[PDB]
């Protein structure tokens, strides 16, 4: 029955983390601060059929920025655009969420406000000196909505 | 509390139907399947922010082809490329449902292929002769979950 899988589901926001259904970094679709929005590159992200694409600089833990597929629409290849133009234009707002936050948590954010994707981060206690935010990989509120309506 | 929210929303999924979520056809972003996938086009289309637009032919409720953000992806404006070569090659899927079907269903059927759009009808016996399906509008899980997960 769904209603018994849902209702289970519900149940375990309390205790599993955003960590646990994640997106983890080497499995996200991403794009470099220094990409060039050309015919191919837009070609490349409309590819992916990800609406929206975290932005790195240097390398792919240092998300910058967050760019979304509807921020091509008025893009002509043919100006060769760099993708730092547009993100600039739009500035779409980048939200953190620490691994060990409770989806029940996590739901409740992504219900408050338009953001449904956060960068999701640890911090780094095993220095090495100075404790610093590792990123981990990305959470959306479909990442939630699977685990509450997941057949188990 | 998020768990009890979503408990009831999962009671109602019972007695709940497509037709108390669903986008009527009225707010339906379509495109008609006369159009020419020329810049201004796609760029209406990627703008609109929908990742799945119905096609229609000659009435809105004439839904003929799904028509993907994603199927542009390798289509160059300047060739002025007719929709119809697009729906032709991708051919996605059409899915058609009654509108007193219940979400409970809805939602199971949505779990078991890929497909997470229906286009919603119901059967109009008011002839006039012969019945007929007419068109109401489109259901996606987007309208299920939120069906679940809202605060009530
Ligand atoms: N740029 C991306 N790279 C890889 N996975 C992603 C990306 N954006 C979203 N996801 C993941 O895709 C799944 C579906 O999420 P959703 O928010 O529906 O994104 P989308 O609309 O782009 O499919 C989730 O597991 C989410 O973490
Ligand atoms: N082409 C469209 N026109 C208008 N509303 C749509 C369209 N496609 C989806 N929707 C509606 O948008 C809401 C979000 O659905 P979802 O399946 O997440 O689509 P999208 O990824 O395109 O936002 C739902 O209420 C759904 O019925």
Do not use: W
Request: with cysteine; net charge negative.
């Amino acid at each position: 029955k769904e209603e018994l899988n849902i209702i289970q589901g519900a149940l375990e926001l309390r205790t599993k983390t955003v960590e646990d259904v994640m997106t983890p970094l080497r499995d996200c679709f991403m794009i470099t601060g220094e990409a060039i929005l050309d015919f191919n590159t837009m070609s490349e992200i409309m590819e992916s059929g990800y609406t929206r694409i975290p932005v790195f600089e240097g390398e792919r833990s240092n998300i910058v920025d967050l760019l979304f597929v509807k921020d091509l629409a008025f893009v002509d290849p043919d100006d060769c655009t760099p993708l730092k133009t547009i993100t600039k234009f739009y500035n779409h707002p980048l939200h953190f969420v620490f691994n060990d936050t409770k989806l029940d948590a996590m739901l409740e954010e992504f219900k408050k406000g338009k953001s449904h994707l956060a960068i999701v981060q640890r911090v780094n206690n095993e220095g090495e000196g100075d404790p610093f935010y590792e990123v981990l990989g990305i959470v959306t509120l479909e990442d939630v909505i699977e685990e509450i309506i997941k057949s188990e």
